[PDB]
RNA sequence: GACCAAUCUAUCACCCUAUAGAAGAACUAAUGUUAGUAUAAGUAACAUGAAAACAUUCUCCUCCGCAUAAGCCUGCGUCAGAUCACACUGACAAUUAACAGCCCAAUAUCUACAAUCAACCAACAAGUCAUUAUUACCCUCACUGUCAACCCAACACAGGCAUGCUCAUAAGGAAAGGUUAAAAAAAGUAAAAGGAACUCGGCAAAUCUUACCCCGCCUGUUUACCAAAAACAUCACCUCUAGCAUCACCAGUAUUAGAGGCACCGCCUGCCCAGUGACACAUGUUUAACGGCCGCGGUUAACCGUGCAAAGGUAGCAUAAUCACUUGUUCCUUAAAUAGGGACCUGUAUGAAUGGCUCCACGAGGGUUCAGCUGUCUCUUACUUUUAACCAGUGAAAUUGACCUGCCCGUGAAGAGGCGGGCAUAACACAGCAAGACGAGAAGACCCUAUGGAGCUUUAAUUUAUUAAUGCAAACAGUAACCUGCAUUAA
RNA sequence: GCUAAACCUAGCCCCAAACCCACUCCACCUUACUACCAGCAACCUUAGCCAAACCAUUUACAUAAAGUAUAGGCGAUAGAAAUUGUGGCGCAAUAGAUAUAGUACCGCAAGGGAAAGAUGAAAAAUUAUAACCAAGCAUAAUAUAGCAAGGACUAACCCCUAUACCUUCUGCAUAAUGAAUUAACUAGAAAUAACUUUGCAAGGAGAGCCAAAGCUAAGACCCCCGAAACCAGACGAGCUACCUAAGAACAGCUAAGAGCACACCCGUCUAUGUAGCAAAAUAGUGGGAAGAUUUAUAGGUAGAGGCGACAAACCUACCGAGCCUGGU
């Protein structure tokens, strides 16, 4: 976790989370269901279809992932052409 | 077993007791059969002159005057001993084979 | 037997095991004397 | 550490040299041999192994004579002073080497064999085949480097060209040059192997500490080995 | 969430208070640290021989005392004041070398017959003492130690300390501060009948002593500081390694050395390389290397039918220091015998240099016993001292939450002096007490937890850092021989 | 009122600023404080604790970029550049540097380590301040009975009541540890993010960072003592184990690593001692006492080591591997 570094004296982000998750400005964490590339011959088509779809994270898991990251990862992402451009902002919500 | 105790001749064994000793200043040497040789040349000779008809005394009188202190320097001695320098209008540069050499302290006091 | 008496004083052995000559022969004693002088002790070695 | 071996003498001398016991210690101070140290004081005797050696302004064969036969505490083989010419020297005492007997020290290799006695010394090139010898040299002018212990004897086998195959007491053959010096007969002090130590007192006096008390487990190397005789070790 | 003791800072204060900034910001406890003081406690420990004119005399003991190497440095002499009384505080000066130390000019160069009354007698452990010719040399008494009641043990310490001396005298010292002798313990003197019958043991004190078993060759050593041996080591035997010289192993040579198993001497060391190790021994050796020497049915068993391998325990010894059976059976030794010993393999897991058996001498080794022995007991008692109590002096420690601290019944984080009910109870002090206060010293050593450790052992998981040998490369000689890098092998 | 209690000034920490010291006289590497005479000396990848709940590869030595790339049993973690640009809101003898001083003391050795004092203008002031403030005692010993206190009572006791504190654990006086009081010291430092209030607003902040109401600034939150144990070098054979050189000791009696027995070496057993004479003592019975015997002096063998007639024993009172330093 490293709350304070040894060279600059700041926080540090676990690259494992950055590589296994995806940050969004809306406040949700996207992931991928495990087992989507191992033992696919014994899985029924419905199971394979459900495993090849993205999934969100819970409140506690999202907070843990945020704690494991810094404010740099919370920046926007105005990519020239990204499939997740229409998901950074969440609209139509009432508590 | 004492560090503050200054080592001297009244501590060690017979060997070191007889070897070190106080400021003896070796005057001779030994000749095998424990027969010390007293070199007459190394024995000092106190050159004491005769104190007959001495004027001064070991104590001065307060009635005498007072003079300023002026440590004698080489320049003053040279200016004083300036007879041949003025007559130009004798010196001992090398004194290696001299009786009492100056630079190498060979004369006692 | 009595184990409270192990010391057999002897100036010869003392000065031979902890002497200026022995402390300056090897660099170990040199460093020892240097550290002692740095500490500020009165006696440096027997 | 400070350890100056007593072995420090230039000119050969007859007087016994003050021997300093070692005790299995090296120049540093650590033990390298277990079972050595603590014995009776001894005085080394300078021995001259090189039998044939012409003295000053000499070269041809010379004669010598035995005067006395004494015991040597350093080795197990007794010695015996033998004077000759204008000098003296110690040499190994051969069997039946009585005092007041003359001994020859030749060198000129004769054409035919030479019926050498028991004390005379001749090169292998003049010794009959099948004659016991001792104090064999490895090379001409080298010196006795093999047979020397008490009761030892080296029987001659044969000669080839300019060498001679010697048979050591351990059935280990060896070939050496024929122009080397040797000695006939066998070493004196016979029956030394049958010496009964009797008690541990004599063993301790000899200067040999006992073995350790650790109960070692006899490994595989503790088995009876029946190896064949090694090949003849030559030196040509 | 609301307040707030102390301090510094910026604000009028100013017989002590307010607004904000800071926490080394606020103690009934962490077997917490420093300083003094209660608690056992004036209890344990303790010395100084007697008379006296303080001149002197008397009683007892002594293996202690003299000088010195090792060691200390003025450490019981005077002067004035401090005090079991003083070796305590300041000045006084010692202790003077002939005893010991402080020590040798060079070059070639050589000392074979040890000492032990050393001559008879000799022996093994083979041994501590010497000089020759030449050159140059002629001045000679310089320096240190010298005391004591003394050294190392935190103490003024029943402790530890070598050399030559009479070891009891010509040296060296005083076990009794004063009174009485309560209880308990210890060191001594004697004991009416027994002499080991209390006791697992003959374990203190006296006799002085007879015959056995196991083991160990005997001497010697071991765990300084609980186990001193039935363990350790070898004089004797046996296995393996080494053909050689310049630091030992070695100024040695196969009858010589190094690494090991057993235990002298006598009878012996019977069998097996399937398996591991060591030998390239042209395919085998080595078991005195690591280790092993078997089962099923039969006229209380030979010999038959056999299965497997290496043999299938040969000789020998026997209820063992030998898994319960075990207090064996068997005959004695006594009044009783799981104590001791004569024979049985049935020891199924004894059995051969991991050594099997007897035996000459011996054991502070471990277990029995015949004739004598003592208070160990039957049943203990008397005396002296140590020691104890009181009178004078000094003077600790373990320990304590506070105590105004009884007993019985039942409960109670499960054994109550403090709880529910009863008995009792004037105040303190000495002289004994060890039933309780789960009494007092040690984070139970026995059991368990520790992804906390360390010692030991390899065929547990990994790397060969190091040694030596192997195949390759550069490295030079031949023809149509040392270092270095890459991988393997045993340690 | 005996014993006690306070004084505060010497000096300490921080940077702010310069870069420091160093032979009158003799003496100092041989045994340091020694006037005097024929022989090699240098350059070395630091390890280790600890975290991944073990642990081997791994674990640190102006601003922004950026805690990004990148490396990593791809897990715990590590982590760059191009570009950029002359006083104390301190301490005031248990605090402050350990310090009045690296002083004794432990000590043969490396190594560890504290306090001295208190009125002032005259101590060449005689002569004492105002007693009062904790812990132990005197002025002043107790008088049925029992957590030491309450309701009370005209009164102390007498009347009724209630089972010490803290920690643990479902459960307590429990007989589970802690504790004699007093004075001093002594144990919660902050983090992506979140809550409240200030200022501006699709912008604010004194470049960099965040923007579908956001940012800035302040306020508020992350304990101490405690092992076994490793690394590298010093210090250690003056006692113990072994070796080396030259010396010393062993009466007498019976008669040969023979026997008894002086001195002498060790201590199989009893008793005393157990904070004692001693952090290993006192008497005999004990084995040897011309030999594997003991010892005076000096030198050598130091821990992954030495030594070892193996006791896996000893190496300076505690050695299944002695202590110190720095990682700790
Ligand atoms: Mg002591
Ligand atoms: Mg307090
Ligand atoms: Mg406690
Ligand atoms: Mg406390
Ligand atoms: Mg008491
Ligand atoms: Mg007395
Ligand atoms: Mg004297
Ligand atoms: Mg008395
Ligand atoms: Mg009678
Ligand atoms: Mg009777
Ligand atoms: Mg009975
Ligand atoms: Mg009985
Ligand atoms: Mg009996
Ligand atoms: Mg008898
Ligand atoms: Mg024996
Ligand atoms: Mg013991
Ligand atoms: Mg014992
Ligand atoms: Mg042995
Ligand atoms: Mg032997
Ligand atoms: Mg057999
Ligand atoms: Mg049995
Ligand atoms: Mg008493
Ligand atoms: Mg009294
Ligand atoms: Mg206690
Ligand atoms: Mg109870
Ligand atoms: Mg109670
Ligand atoms: Mg208790
Ligand atoms: Mg415990
Ligand atoms: Mg650990
Ligand atoms: Mg560990
Ligand atoms: Mg850690
Ligand atoms: Mg770890
Ligand atoms: Mg840059
Ligand atoms: Mg201080
Ligand atoms: Mg301080
Ligand atoms: Mg008070
Ligand atoms: Mg109360
Ligand atoms: Mg609490
Ligand atoms: Mg707690
Ligand atoms: Mg519970
Ligand atoms: Mg309690
Ligand atoms: Mg919003
Ligand atoms: Mg010694
Ligand atoms: Mg020994
Ligand atoms: Mg015993
Ligand atoms: Mg006791
Ligand atoms: Mg014996
Ligand atoms: Mg005897
Ligand atoms: Mg005798
Ligand atoms: Mg250590």
Q: CB count, 10 Å around CB of D167?
A: 18
Q: Look up tokens 């400070």; give the residue.
A: D2
Planar angle of CA D143, D147, D148, nearest 5 degrees: 80
Chain C nearest-CA distance from B66, in A, is 47
Using the mean position of ligand 47's atoms as its centre, give its distance from the Cα of residue D214 in Å.
22
Question: How wide is the angle at C-alpha B51 spanned by C-alphas B48 and B57, nearest 5°?
Answer: 115
Tokens of A72: 């740099």
Q: Are the Cβ atoms of B3 and C46 closer than 8 angstroms? A: yes
Work out the minimum CA distance from B18 to partner chain C, whole angstroms. Answer: 14
In 10 A of CB D125, how many CB atoms? 21
Rounded to 5 degrees, what angle do the CA atoms B100, B106, B107 make?
65
Cβ-nearest to B3 among C7, C11, C43: C43
Contacts of B11 in chain C (CB under 8 A): 11
Name residue, tokens 């541990």: D200
The minimal CB distance from B13 to the residues C12, C43, C46 is found for C12
Task: Select from D194, D156, D190 the least CA-distant residue to D176.
Answer: D156
Residues D35 and D203 sit within 8 Å (Cβ to Cβ):
no
How was this structure determined? It was done by cryo-EM
b vs e for D42-71, b when ≥16 Cβ sit within 10 Å of the residue's Cβ?
A: bebbebebebbeeeeeeeeebebebeeeee
Q: Identify the CA nearest to D187 among candidates D140, D136, D139.
A: D136
Q: Which residue's entry shows tokens 């040509």?
A: D236
Pairing relationship of beta strands D183-184 and D132-134 according to DSSP bridges:
antiparallel
Residue D221: left if φ>0, alpha if ψ -120 to 50, beta else—which one?
alpha
What is the stated resolution of the deposited model, in angstroms? 3.9
Q: Strand F within 7 Å of which CB atoms in C 1-40? A: 1-4, 6-10, 12-24, 26, 28-29, 31-32, 35-36, 39-40
């Amino acid at each position: 976790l490293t709350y304070f570094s040894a060279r600059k004296g700041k926080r540090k982000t676990v690259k494992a989370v950055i590589d296994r998750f995806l940050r969004l400005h809306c406040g949700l964490w996207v992931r991928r269901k495990a087992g989507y590339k191992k033992k696919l011959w014994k899985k029924t088509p419905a199971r394979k279809k459900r495993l090849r779809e993205f999934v969100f994270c819970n409140k506690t898991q999202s907070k843990l992932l945020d704690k494991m990251t810094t404010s740099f990862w919370k920046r926007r992402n105005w990519y020239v052409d990204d499939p997740y451009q229409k998901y950074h902002d969440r609209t139509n919500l009432k508590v | 077993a004492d560090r503050m105790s200054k080592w001297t001749s009244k501590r060690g064994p017979r060997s070191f007791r007889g070897r070190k000793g106080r400021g003896a200043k070796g005057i001779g040497f030994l000749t095998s059969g424990w027969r010390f040789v007293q070199i007459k040349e190394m024995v000092p000779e106190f050159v004491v002159p005769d104190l007959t008809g001495f004027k001064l005394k070991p104590y001065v009188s307060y009635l005498a005057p007072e003079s300023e202190e002026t440590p004698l320097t080489a320049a003053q001695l040279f200016s004083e001993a300036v007879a041949p320098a003025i007559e130009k209008d004798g010196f001992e540069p090398t004194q290696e084979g001299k009786l009492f050499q100056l630079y190498p302290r060979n004369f006692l006091r | 037997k009595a184990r409270g008496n192990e010391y057999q004083p002897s100036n010869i052995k003392r000065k031979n095991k902890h002497g200026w000559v022995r402390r300056l022969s090897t660099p170990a004693g040199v460093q020892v004397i240097l550290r002692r002088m740095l500490k500020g002790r009165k006696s440096l070695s027997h | 550490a400070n350890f100056v071996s007593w072995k420090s003498r230039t000119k050969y001398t007859i007087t016994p040299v003050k021997m300093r016991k070692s005790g299995g210690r090296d120049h540093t101070g650590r033990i390298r041999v277990h079972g050595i140290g603590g014995g009776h004081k001894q005085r080394y005797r300078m021995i001259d192994f090189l039998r044939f050696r012409p003295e000053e302004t000499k070269s041809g064969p010379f004669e010598e004579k035995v005067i006395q036969v004494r015991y040597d505490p350093c080795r197990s083989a007794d010695i015996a002073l033998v004077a000759g010419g204008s000098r003296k020297r110690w040499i190994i005492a051969t069997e039946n080497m009585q005092a007041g007997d003359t001994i020859l020290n030749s060198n000129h290799i004769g054409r035919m064999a030479v019926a050498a006695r028991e004390g005379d010394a001749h090169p292998l090139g003049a010794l009959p085949v099948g004659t016991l010898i001792n104090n064999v040299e490895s090379e001409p002018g080298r010196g006795a480097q093999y047979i020397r212990a008490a009761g030892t004897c080296g029987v001659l086998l044969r000669k080839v060209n300019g060498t001679a195959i010697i048979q050591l007491p351990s059935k280990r053959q060896m070939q050496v040059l024929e122009t080397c010096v040797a000695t006939v007969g066998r070493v004196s002090n016979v029956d030394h192997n049958k010496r009964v130590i009797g008690k541990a007192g004599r063993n301790r006096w000899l200067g040999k500490r006992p073995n350790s008390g650790r109960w070692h487990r006899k490994g595989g190397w503790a088995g009876r080995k029946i190896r064949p005789l090694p090949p003849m070790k030559s030196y040509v």
